[PDB]
Symmetry: D2
């Protein structure tokens, strides 16, 4: 693990005290400064936090100020950077119906102020990305929330934030994080797709992208790799949260690759074996996971390293997969690269196509319909590389 | 049922022979002229079809020609219109890896030709919408499909169709139909969101929208009404396919309202209790369902009528819900309408918001967080309206 | 709502303060005597609780005794009974790996002790059923739990509890409550089926049954009504927890009928329209739900009453359904009752079946296969009864 | 793969012509004798079949007789055996509402005769297991099927079959195969648990067990390895069907290990690293899968071989896993084996347990509650073994 690997961890990840919906915390609170030292140590290049993770909701400026100074010291000494910050718009009871989209007008005004403030701190620490997780934006009942009005209000708030950042010269990028449910019955912008469509409607869309999370897409049983590929095609992959999940159930937040292992592999392959050797993605490889409730601080550090471990083992196998002449031969036989050739010849339009008898009148669909694509075999070669059997 | 209600059915719904993945057909073939006659009789205002549902794959021109004239005569006599047409790019073995996105370049070329042909016929019959269902676009294995190249090719093909329509003066609108899976392990553009985001990237986006299907969103456990609300917000709801489903499992295609009843109710409320007093959506209410395999032709006509009956029954209760004073009161208590009031006062920006001590510095979040929204009570009044209990 | 309806509620239901996985409690603590009062007022005939709901974990004998006496007075004054009691084996950190099947043997012994104590209290308050919810029984990782050993230890603990109850003459019945996941990644005895199979291997199986909960089976997308019909077939429906859920996602605990309305309808029909006119189930109709986090104490009593109103409105429609002559006619056409007639004639065995040419050699499968069952029409009539449209 | 590996395939697997719910077959039919030869050649020890796979539905006795004789010769010459047989009670239209549980009495009678006839052929080919897949036993609508009457009729048919077998001295064991849905909306006996609980109610339970299939339990998002563990505890694992699936969606029938890889790994560990060095299960390792629709006959044989490769690679990794002193040390730290030690001391009863102050009075819940189990670390070593990183 090198700083060039860009592994980052949220302070709320290793810091999770393990108080779930059904029981009390099983671990004590982790000191930010300590987190900073431990992460530095296991090989992370950066740390992220929610305003309320570092400074307890409601601290006076004196306390608030003190905490920041100490945190700043720790980054200093260790060389860790803060690539991204986020705001907590979900924990306090006032946000029970959302921040930006709460039906109560006062709550919406307050939620914007809370974020502007976090934007200030972010800028001060050199953060380039503001992640927005609208965990409480949504509903349990259909008649309780006007989605249209809600989207108008989500948009109004975001447009203000971009206005401010651009005026203060912060140069932040905004990353909307999709989640289908939990804690609300249904959350607005439920998938990477919905989040991308929404961003295209903002005032300065170029400043906005998405921060998709492994488990979030898997909670709806979607293919995370395929969703990232789409995000990459759109050029809206501004950040990414890696973790593990076992399908449609509560959000598990397991270590990266401890859930759908086969998808974890295709994912590393997509991010790393980009066009011309180079990665297809350049930002932080952020782990937004939780050390299982059954573990102690020993278990905590273990799990932090397991994340890095899993990513580096998969990368290694994805590289070997692509480099294998037999895979290279199977890729050819399956015509994977033929999808890159335009369907139409150069300068060809409808008329030329309509005049080409070979594309219709004289085409033998039955004969082409019978040739196999060799996909099972290519798939089997991939898994054998994953398994270290090749 | 009135023509003003705009209920339409696909030829392939009532005409489905009930040959499933595990058994033979239990019903004989339905004659198209017959279908037009029976549908006219139950109150449908229009009929739709895939090319291959009307004219059997590979019919010579004489044959094809003959079928169309008979069909147009039936239309004529009954007063039924053809609001939308679509193309079968999924049945024939040549389409096993997709039509527009098949790895094989020749299939992609053939796929476009098959659609242009269907476009002409739709144009000829007065159809206004071309529905595109990319059922074979996707994969079973991640290494088999280059998603980026696939999107490029899906885009390449649609740009061409719009070019053609526009040059010819056809005036067609194009509606992409999302589905998460089945027949492919994962289909490209899996949710309403992914499809909207994609469309925003074509050459003439104003010409493209979506055709979301109740059951397809429910196969991922998404809130159908909430995704339609988002589609309407983007102004991309070009068509809608109504049916029923029981969560994530194979596509059931039940009668509209026979799966998630509460969501069927909230959907009808959304489409009908629109902006003025007026519907929020003005297109065809299309039923894309299948009469259960256990039914004979009496069952088929019963199921067609059930679709219209479910809609009209829900419409009537949605209307009553909104007209109830007790509901008005509950809506007031839950602050539904307050979401429609901008968060900011007219002419207020971040400078004015930052200057407002009451939006943050003097804001009593604890007090606000203690008041209830009364959402359960609102939901209970809605359900009682649904049950005719009020 | 009469006391004969036998609506009961857990203290933890209306007492949920709404501290979820992602946020703080939105409501203050509810006083138990008050709860007894409030529930008696809305129509409940009994109240239930976990040891720890009534007496704070780590209460001195004096305090504990103090609480109980006040609680009994309240029941006294109100006329409410305690039909069932349960034990909390999921909250305290020591149970992080389970109670009865913790890998740690000291935890198992402690868990048993904790239950015996509740049995005593239960026996003393007149409870008839001990519900066992193994929420911490399971694992996040396959190699961490020997399922066979865990089943042995689960059995070993239950055998003892039955032994004790029988010897102290408590007359308790034990109801195992299945849940597929949450809080453990995977819980042991995930469905009503697994729980029944397990019970059958105990020493005095006649003393054990299950307590299935609507939401738990729906978390796996199973048909709750159908599972309950299987439970009744086996005679293992010792208790039932009613609530609502929107498929595979976190456990929602909505008001009964606020999730899958169609299945809530069919369930009420099955429990009430039992053979010989009479209900097929005579135990408590217990609501194990949670007033939404967006609600205050008024929303809380509103939600309690909604559970009762939903059950009674559905009951009324299930009876009207069964009483409708047209329904009677559709049931006959669907041959619902013909399934009750044995396949074999009295005294026929394989020898006589083999001799019947009409059951095989001369059977016309094709003519039988062509006749429809009229199921769609029958379903349509059920729904129309549910909507009060008939 | 040796014959000792006992890998078997259904004739219907490699012989699936790939006609799905949305398209035509992509492959021509496979001759059963050719399938026998090909299978033997890749290392299979046995072949299985549904009556209708070998002998076309409605074949005259001369035709049927010829097929069987040719079949037997191939078996002879290759040395392959027939370990299990099954009956098709799902394809023909007559079975649209089920076989044994159809509402129509005559269908129930014919279903039993179809099965008796297959039992004869089975017994003559030396099969020891009869698998029962009730694919059509269920409903799309709740009111269409009396479940209780259905279970009565199911049991009635099964008792007769056991009777006939016992009387003819066939010595067959019966394995019910659970499936949650598809082709019916909901299938009776939906999970391995439901089928086990049902079997326990038959006249001769000892002759009955289950045939669970990987994808089927994953269709409900259940832990397959954990449910197999429970089946082994009950001693009802009479047979097993191995394949791949991606959570809740249509039945994919991918090659074993191509779905949930991590669960495939823990499944192979459970079966082979049984108690006493030896496998915990000794029946056939049957592959009930389908070669993807995109493949030709080369892809079909490649996929048959992929199943066996998949199983042997995971077996090798499972073995190394367990022989690793670091893994053993982690197991000890996680206390996995301590679950195998009774909770109660020998001769200890409730009286003695009540007497141990160390189990309650003097129990430090708080101190125990703070020790970590090291489960993450153990999971990490398990995956490093699978990855061949160790």
């Amino acid at each position: 693990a090198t700083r060039e690997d860009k592994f980052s961890f949220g302070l709320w990840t290793v810091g999770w005290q393990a108080r779930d919906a059904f029981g009390d915390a099983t671990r004590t609170a982790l000191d930010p400064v300590e987190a900073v030292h431990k992460l530095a140590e296991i090989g992370a290049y950066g740390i992220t936090f929610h305003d309320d993770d570092l400074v307890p909701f409601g601290s006076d400026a004196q306390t608030r100020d003190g905490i920041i100074a100490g945190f700043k010291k720790a980054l200093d000494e260790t060389g860790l950077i803060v690539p991204m910050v986020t705001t907590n718009l979900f924990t306090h009871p006032v946000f029970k119906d959302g921040g930006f989209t709460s039906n109560d007008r006062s709550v919406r005004r307050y939620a914007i102020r809370k974020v502007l403030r976090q934007m200030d701190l972010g800028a001060e620490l050199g953060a380039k990305t503001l992640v927005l997780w609208g965990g409480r934006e949504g509903a349990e009942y259909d008649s309780a929330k006007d989605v249209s009005a809600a989207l108008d209000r989500y948009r109004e708030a975001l447009n203000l934030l971009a206005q401010y950042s651009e005026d203060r010269g912060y140069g932040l990028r905004f990353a909307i994080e999709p989640k289908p449910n939990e804690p609300r019955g249904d959350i607005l912008l439920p998938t990477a797709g919905h989040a991308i469509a929404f961003v295209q409607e903002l005032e300065r869309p170029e400043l906005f992208g998405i921060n998709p999370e492994t488990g979030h897409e898997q909670m709806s049983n979607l293919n995370f790799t395929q969703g990232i590929a789409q995000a990459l095609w759109h050029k809206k992959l501004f950040h990414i949260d890696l973790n593990g999940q076992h399908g449609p159930k509560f959000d598990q937040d397991l270590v990266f690759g401890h859930g759908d292992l086969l998808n974890a592999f295709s994912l590393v392959d997509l991010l790393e074996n980009g066009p011309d050797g180079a990665p297809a993605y350049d930002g932080p490889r952020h782990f937004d996971y939780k050390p299982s409730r059954t573990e102690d601080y020993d278990g905590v550090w273990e799990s932090a390293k397991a994340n890095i471990r899993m990513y580096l083992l998969l990368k290694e196998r994805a590289k070997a997969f692509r480099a294998d002449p037999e895979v290279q031969e199977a890729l050819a036989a399956s015509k994977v690269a033929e999808l890159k050739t335009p369907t139409l010849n150069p300068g060809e339009g409808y008329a030329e196509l309509l005049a080409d008898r070979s594309a219709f009148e004289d085409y033998d669909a039955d004969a082409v319909g019978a040739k196999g694509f060799g996909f099972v075999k290519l798939n089997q070669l991939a898994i054998e590389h994953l398994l270290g059997a090749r």
